[PDB]
Amino acid sequence: RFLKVKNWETDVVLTDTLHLKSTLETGCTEHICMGSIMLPTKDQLFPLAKEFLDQYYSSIKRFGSKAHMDRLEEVNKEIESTSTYQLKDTELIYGAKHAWRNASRCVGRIQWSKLQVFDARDCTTAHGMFNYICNHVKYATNKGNLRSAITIFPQRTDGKHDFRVWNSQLIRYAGYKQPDGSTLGDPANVQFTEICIQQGWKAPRGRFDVLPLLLQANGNDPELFQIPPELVLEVPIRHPKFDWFKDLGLKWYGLPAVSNMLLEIGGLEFSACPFSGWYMGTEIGVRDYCDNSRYNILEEVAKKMDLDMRKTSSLWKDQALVEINIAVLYSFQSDKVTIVDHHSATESFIKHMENEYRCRGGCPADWVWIVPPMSGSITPVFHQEMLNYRLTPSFEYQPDPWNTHVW
Template identity: 35%
Template sequence: MDEVKRRARRFLSDPALPGDRRVRVAQALRSLDEKGTYQLTGAELDHGLKMAWRNDPRCIRRGTYPTLRQLSWDGVVRMDVSRTELTAERVIAAVGTYLREATNGGRLKPMIMVFPPDTPEGPRLRIWNDQLIRYAGEARPDGSILGDPKHVDLTAALRRLGWAEPIGRQTVLPVAFQLHDGVPIWATLPKDDILEVRLTHPDFGWLREVDFVWHALPAISRMVVVVGGLVLPAIFSGWYVASEILENLHRFGVLHQFAERLGMDRRDRFLLNRIEPIAFDIIMHSFRSAGVMIEDPWAADANLHRFVEQEKSAGRVLCGDKSRLVLAGATPDMHARTDTYLPPDPDADPGFHYLPEAWAPLT
């Protein structure tokens, strides 16, 4: 409790917040003594969420943090959200609302949905999927993987919970979650809420036979936001950078399919150097022709550099995880490699915190 009080005092004393900060700090500390928690006002929560995104060491597009939009999961006033009880039905409905609102027909926008904060007794909500939309993966008898190799363990955990749908190359997994550390619950995402982009290009008609899609919305969901010592489960999304889609193509073996279609020698040690520019062109064309927002890595990297310089001029040095910020196809001057960052702060407040796998004991 002493640590929560320290964090609450520090955050609520921020002069960027409206009102008498000394009075507000006293109110919050009194509530912590009496109830073990306190409530953020709408202005405090909005400011805290934007600062958490600004502080996120993994996000290359955090320079747009002022545009972050909150999405109420239950229609209640934000300052009263901690008095609203979570149920499985409400969480499932909130996930559907988030998918529809954040996807916005392909016109993606930075958005976050926060749920009631954890209590002194433990977590309120934990979503198992690292993103709301993930593709299943299972090992075949011959040792090969059908579907996404990255999500074999999550698929196995969902099987243990009773999910029995046969899978193909790209079968969307249910979303699984726990309330109050209780029995895991899973729910199938409605197909109409999932926008997928099929790879197409006017110069490569064979893409119809490759038959590969990727979901438009990267909605991070195995995370919490810490604001003023309060731990709030959250869903957060912006839009993809093309290099992230490229990583998925590589994992599914699609780049080698491209190489075969283009008559390239798979033994060529420079194969990826030759095929990646073509893949970037295909990715950008596919998303743009489908009307789905996407960013090329050069623009994202330049945006990050501008943001770093902006923060420096304000006397701040950002935390940064360079393993996440150096993108494939980065700009020639490699801003993401040369910009100065502090090490990521595991206790950042306000801050985004990405959680470990919850299903490990079940697999």
């Protein structure tokens, strides 16, 4: 019931008790581990509200005070009456910070308490959403000195009036299927790119076209908006040794901003809660650039390096992979756009785990996601045992809006 995790490189053992708080289910059982699977009413609401308010009041050292007992009654009265309730600003901010704190798949959590929360619960239209989003993008970008932020739209009510951002990230590049059977730009975004086109967006039909926002307010049909180019910080990708690297025509955007997740706080559901931080270099260099189903540039890069591509055992893929990732980091750094390398990020995460174990009694962590997609064992997280479990407040997946929406 008290659980130990060991770091096999340093012999540091931590004791986890925080998992006993856990409420939601993992997908695993005593007979089967599902650790590598990507996706494994009034009566329901009051327990959820109570559990949340309890941890809130405990966090401000006011557990069992009249202020606590008063607020519990007030929300209870509100649920009895309205079948929902509203969070105080303080509770909203605490909830958002903790949803990040609880994100077991996130290596960047040493930062969790520095999150700027933008309360957009007063928003009513897609134009208003567009406005809040531009303000977030400009704030978070901060001319390259990136700052973590979340913008929180109105919570789910009856579920026929959902606020949604249809985009998967606020800033992403378009994807087009071509006569060749090949794909121009980002293949991950082909379907969304089709929705935008068929919604009215005239597409430049290039390799790096910033997608338009498709914003749904109050369950209405979503609407297109171009983010002002001056608010989209992009980085041309060059190499500090290889002159020809720039000739590849590669670029990426500075601001990673997830817009398709659902924030749950005290039972309340925020279906539009775009959040942003900054990149770890591997996300772009390894996954975005080198996944076979993404920009898949390994072949073209190895060619320019004149590597022996005859045999897998020359490790030509591995050599090209390193160079690409050197280039991503060198470029962002040269242009003063915040980025973290995988060595620095994983080192920070170990330190964060240690903080959380002593301060909180644990830290839910999903090893499969935390270990970087290159050079796994030369980062400290590889050698760190992790316990994965689900705490609330949380960010959760939710299905893509087009499958759900009633036009």
